[PDB]
Symmetry: none
Subunit: 85 residues, 16 copies
């Protein structure tokens, strides 16, 4: 995805932990991330580090699986994604 890579500087900044545990919920229900790739993200204390944990697991997982993150970002935390565009 070109969108996630170009906005990755702000998506590791303004994202926030309270939506990261909600986005990685929908990424697990849709069988993208397994349980142990959630525990890599959600166990890190700083919200910027868990934001680095998702995005580098998105960009390795194809381009069609980048969408299911971005569909989960337009549902949870829409005012970021409205301002991100």
């Amino acid at each position: 995805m070109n969108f996630i890579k170009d906005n990755s500087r702000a998506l590791i900044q303004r994202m926030g932990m309270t939506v990261i545990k909600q986005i990685t919920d929908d990424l697990f229900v849709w069988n993208v991330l397994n349980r142990e790739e959630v525990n890599i993200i959600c166990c890190e204390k700083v919200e910027q580090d868990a934001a680095r944990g998702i995005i580098h697991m998105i960009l390795k997982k194809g381009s069609e699986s980048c969408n299911l993150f971005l569909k989960s970002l337009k549902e949870w935390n829409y005012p970021l994604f409205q301002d991100l565009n």
Copy 2:
């Protein structure tokens, strides 16, 4: 395996450490890698280096033992293997 060799440039890139410790779990349970060939992989810090550690232990171990890696890659980290095809 022709599949692992041709995709080895991307499989050392998009694989990720969180699944490498999960794939080398199933490779140990199925008696492919012993314990000391897991410690060569999982002790390396960069996730790209542990990805070079598995694949060069796969390609030396036959062709029928390449499958048990690839069966473990369609279970753990399927959105890579879906996008890898």
Copy 3:
């Protein structure tokens, strides 16, 4: 132990940190693990990594000392060990 090795793929998955700090309690009281081999396990953040930390310290410690783990798994977290069989 043949039982721990064959189920090691699921025992690093469904085990959970809340019982790992309870199993390695009973492994320390029964003088299997010393204190520094508990700190290797319990300091790791992901619950799958501490689960890899116990099991690879069990399989190196004999076969009769594998039982004291498995006796501690039928006391703490029995619904796993009921479903594991």
Copy 4:
């Protein structure tokens, strides 16, 4: 359980703390969760985090032990489970 996994996005959202301390009561009386796996759940402040604490302790504990959660969800908080179906 396929039911808990597919509805896990909504079950960490609409569940609520007042029933989570009541469901983990029945999970303790039926010897699924011990006391220390209740203290992992009930000590977390946000009701969404304790909801993530139960469900990831259910999915690791077999499939037959997923039912005793779901029997406790049709007794306590039935209007969720009526609307969940």
Copy 5:
């Protein structure tokens, strides 16, 4: 201390947070634990984790300093220590 080590499985279970903040009070007044070794114990949320925090700071601090814990356990929470013997 042989007594604390042998009962450490139950002392991290039945102890309880409400006495752990009272025992580590008397351990601070008697100059065993400083303030920062109380903050390691009392900031942990689960009462079993703060119980692991005291006991592993007792067993490292000599054998004569194990007594001042045990004198503080026969004053605060005597019905445990009565049933512990």
Copy 6:
């Protein structure tokens, strides 16, 4: 700063978390620490560890930026800074 370095043993001891989240407020408003260097400090549980987190981010940030910490310590928690001198 010679003042912060010489008193750093007591400033990681008597500082306290309730003022550390107030000092790192004024350090963020004055554009010294960004948001992610606050999350390194304030997410640590022990108040001595967050006190080690500020001071080692002060001493790396110049000498003129050490003052804005010390101006924020004479406003918030003056009875320490009165007794520190």
Copy 7:
């Protein structure tokens, strides 16, 4: 760059890990460092070692690509770069 080389003794000292993971974010978005040259930096535990990891990847990458580091150092951690001049 003459500026980075002459200040490299202090830039491996006062830089700090919390900005190094933020600078190497902007170095990746601007296509200077790929992902595996971030994992060489950010996986090292000491903040001085990750600071040696960036700067020796800057000085090998041209002189015009030294600027994009220095533009990212005047945005993230400006009080260093103000005091560095």
Copy 8:
């Protein structure tokens, strides 16, 4: 120092991380360890490994600089040093 070397087996065992970050505070204020030799110690996860990190930096730093460690061990964690003698 003959005292630190002979008790180094127990000083890497019973020391504990909560005092190691307090001893290496006083070792930095007294200009023995610089900042990067603290980051070698305090970034290691196991408390036994950070205890190996101090003592092997003491025994290389003279004999008169071994005292300032031992003066900092009779202030912080005296019940060890009382029982160590």
Copy 9:
């Protein structure tokens, strides 16, 4: 190749190990280097020595096979190759 030979003084200097293990990945997938000619390169500790290991295996392998190195250098580590021209 005239380009690799003339810039070989800087290509053994500014190249870096983190891209050398990535370039020799693409050189192996495209059947230029076999596995044992990668192990000559990647096992050498200094990044300048592995850079001498690739280039002297390029210049012996034809001129049309020099391109596949240079195509792999415009993909991995482009800011060198941008500044190299």
Copy 10:
């Protein structure tokens, strides 16, 4: 020693790094290994390689100095040495 040589295949397998840094502690306190012969062992990443590092420094150091290893193996990691016999 006939015991160490005959069991050297399993002692480089089931030993584990967490006890190797504890055995080479007691080997240093008893003046068998100096500091630089510990750094040969403990700096190697794989736990099997540090296990090869001790044993080949034992078998070169006499037969009476093989005992002090074996006394340190019956104290630290007794369930191996119980199962080793």
Copy 11:
């Protein structure tokens, strides 16, 4: 041995260093290779060179001593020896 000689082209290719240090362990315990004939093998950096080091020490050592290598290859690295046949 006719088997080792005919497969020596692949046994210096697919063998791997992680099993070569494990095979030459069992060759030393069974008194085939002494210590200095292990140091000829295991000190070579490329895994293909240590594989040339074993096999040319096997073929000089009789035919009955070729078996103890091949018994150690059916225990360590069986998926090669399964695919080798």
Copy 12:
């Protein structure tokens, strides 16, 4: 062979040691070179000298035995032999 003789100026130049130890592997398995005619080649330090060692042992060994070298050069180091034609 007319092909080896005419290209012998470049085959002692661009060949490389890493393939010379691989070609003389296949020349030994096919019973062309014995072991002592490999030790004449592979013990020479410069890769150009071992390249002079093979080719002058090829041209003395018939013309039909020149092919088995050239079949081993189209398998190992094909990009030379592609560019050699």
Copy 13:
């Protein structure tokens, strides 16, 4: 330098890696060691070997360039250099 040569037995012993990467920082900023003579030092695993790597690059580089090492040893690791005199 007579001072470095006479104390070279202790300077390869008590120096330590954490200051060797800091001394060779200042030796690079002052244009004594280039980058590839740092990679010879800092890539060696044992701290005694990197200490042998600096000192034998000092004694070959003049006598006036021995001072810039010794000025960097009185800034970084002064308690050694205080005890060295």
Copy 14:
């Protein structure tokens, strides 16, 4: 050259291998030494022997080609050449 001949006793002593592989890089780029006259130098293990290998290939190659060595010695390893004068 009179300068190289008179200082050849010290230039085979204080030169060092890490610059010899860097000087013979620039001697190859400037078409003085071909590849096989580098392999005579750089394959020798002792750094004094490779230093004898360059200088006796300089003094045979004219006097105007002695300069390109000496220009490469004032760029790489200037503190020798500063102290050599």
Copy 15:
């Protein structure tokens, strides 16, 4: 020396590289071996070969200079020299 010659079979066996680089340190500080006679010893890969390198440089260097080796062997690696007698 009669002692070194008679024990030279075991001193090239049980000595070990980690003390050989420490003994040849003290042999250089005491002006026995120059730098180039250390590089003959320490550059050899097998620890038995560097042990042959010292002893044959001792026996050529007088009998009074054999002592300074043996004084350096009773300081570094005393448990050999205790068992050697």
Copy 16:
């Protein structure tokens, strides 16, 4: 000796350099070969040539001095001498 002469065709073939430097160690300690008759053997590069160097120095040195070779061949490299009989 009739045994060495009749097996001299295989003893110059299967012997190997790693034991030849170990046999000529024991031949020197027992005052058979002096130092200069070791340097004739061990300086030859091919292991078959050093094997021709020992045996033709054995057969000239009596018959009772042939035994001390053969006693040193039943200690070092016994699996040859077991298969030689």
